[PDB]
């Protein structure tokens with residue numbers, strides 16, 4: 061008889077499945093640890109009216125990107141960048157696009173409109189995002205101003221999760237095997253010493269990020285620039301060891317210009333040598349709130 065064929069099943073379109081053919085590159089946004097992020101328009105109607113999205117893709121780190129995608133898929137918070145979906149062995153992460161970019165780009169261009177009050181509001185928002193991430197049992201491991209996106213003049217969001225790891229249930233930290241290309245000038249002593257990462261290690265990193273925020277991400281006042289002034293620039297493979305000794309002595313990044321001592325004291329609580337002595341994200345939120353109102 062006639063040719064037999066398969067009954068075509070009822071198909072429901074997945075709003076989180078972006079077709080390669082419609083995902084059109086505009087420009088690069090940034091690079092970060094084996095991945096790169098691009099501005100695209102997803103333009104199924106082919107008329108330049110589709111939504112702008114941030115697309116993360118790789119240049120076996122496919123496995124790491126897959127875990128990152130799955131972490132971000134299940135994070136839902138006002139101060140965490142929004143997952144939109146995937147474009148599919150290979151895969152791309154699709155996220156909302158925030159035109160104002162990172163705090164590293166934004167703050168130097170917007171000093172006049174961002175006063176201390178607004179800086180402290182951003183600080184709270186970063187803390188709420190981090191306290192949410194820690195309540196899901198993750199350590200970020202890459203908290204710096206360059207990874208904080210500007211949604212608006214009034215709102216920031218944590219914008220990349222390239223290094224984010226789960227902490228095991230009933231355990232206090234994650235041991236990092238891979239520690240090359242580590243942001244050492246943002247890292248707590250236990251991270252530099254023993255490759256161990258606690259929620260308190262993220263609190264330390266937040267202190268450094270707060271410093272960046274208060275200096276408006278001035279390149280000449282960067283945590284890297286200031287620490288290398290402290291320890292000596294040209295030491296190469298000995299740099300991290302000299303950094304560790306500096307922190308053991310009790311030395312810390314100085315008070316930002318025009319930063320009130322009361323704000324600096326909150327920052328210093330992020331930088332107690334022992335993780336267990338550091339402030340929490342919630343106590344920081346209470347601290348900033350008190351200085352705001």
Ligand SMILES: CCc1ccccc1N(C)c1cc2c(cn1)ncn2C
Pocket residue numbers: 089090091092096097114141155156157158159161162206207208209218219220
């Ligand atoms: C979070 C900042 C960042 C990190 C790594 C690569 C690129 C970027 N940049 C600069 C970026 C990311 C963005 C963005 C706007 N810029 N909008 C949504 N995302 C994920």
Ligand code: NA
Pocket residue numbers: 130134
């Ligand atoms: Na899952």
Ligand code: NA
Pocket residue numbers: 132133134135136142143
């Ligand atoms: Na989500």
Ligand code: NA
Pocket residue numbers: 159160
């Ligand atoms: Na733009």
